[PDB]
Structure 1
Amino acid sequence: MRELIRLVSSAGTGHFYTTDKNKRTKPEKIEIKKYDPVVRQHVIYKEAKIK
């Protein structure tokens, strides 16, 4: 089953997104570009642990 993850911004701010993924089929970490409200720019987000 799909397991929850967290996407945390490359900026020093603690802002994060949340989603889920297929850990068995896609093992590589998700490296997405999203909008950071705190700094107000589009930056890079990286996977972490939802727990």
Structure 2
Amino acid sequence: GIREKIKLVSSAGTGHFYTTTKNKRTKPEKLELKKFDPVVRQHVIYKEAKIK
């Protein structure tokens, strides 16, 4: 296993985040997706971050 897990953090500042994986050899550009934020109870754009 060489694919590494990443976290997608909401841009709304609630601090909620999702986790997934991404291929580091390809697709260098950051991952942007619209996902539901339970804190604001709305679907917002989630931005890629680093798991730590």
**TM-score band (shorter)?**
over 0.9
Q: Distance in 2 between matches of 1:10 and 1:26?
A: 21
Aligned pair count?
51
Q: Distance in 1 between matches of 2:41 and 2:12?
A: 11
The Cα of 1:20 is off from its aligned counterpart by 0.5
Q: Percent identity?
A: 86
2:9 counterpart of 1:14: no
Q: Equivalent residue of 1:5, what SS? A: strand
Q: Distance in 1 between matches of 2:37 and 2:31?
A: 17
Query: Which runs of 4 or more aligned residues in structure 1 lie more than 6 Å from their structure 2 counterparts after TM superposition?
Result: none
Q: Equivalent residue of 1:13, what SS? A: coil
The Cα of 1:25 is off from its aligned counterpart by 1.0
Counterpart residue number, 2:30: 29
The aligned amino acid for 1:10 is S
Structure 1: which 5+ residue stretches go unaligned?
none
Structure 2: which 5+ residue stretches go unaligned?
none
**What TM-score, normalized to structure 2?**
0.92
**What TM-score, normalized to structure 1?**
0.93
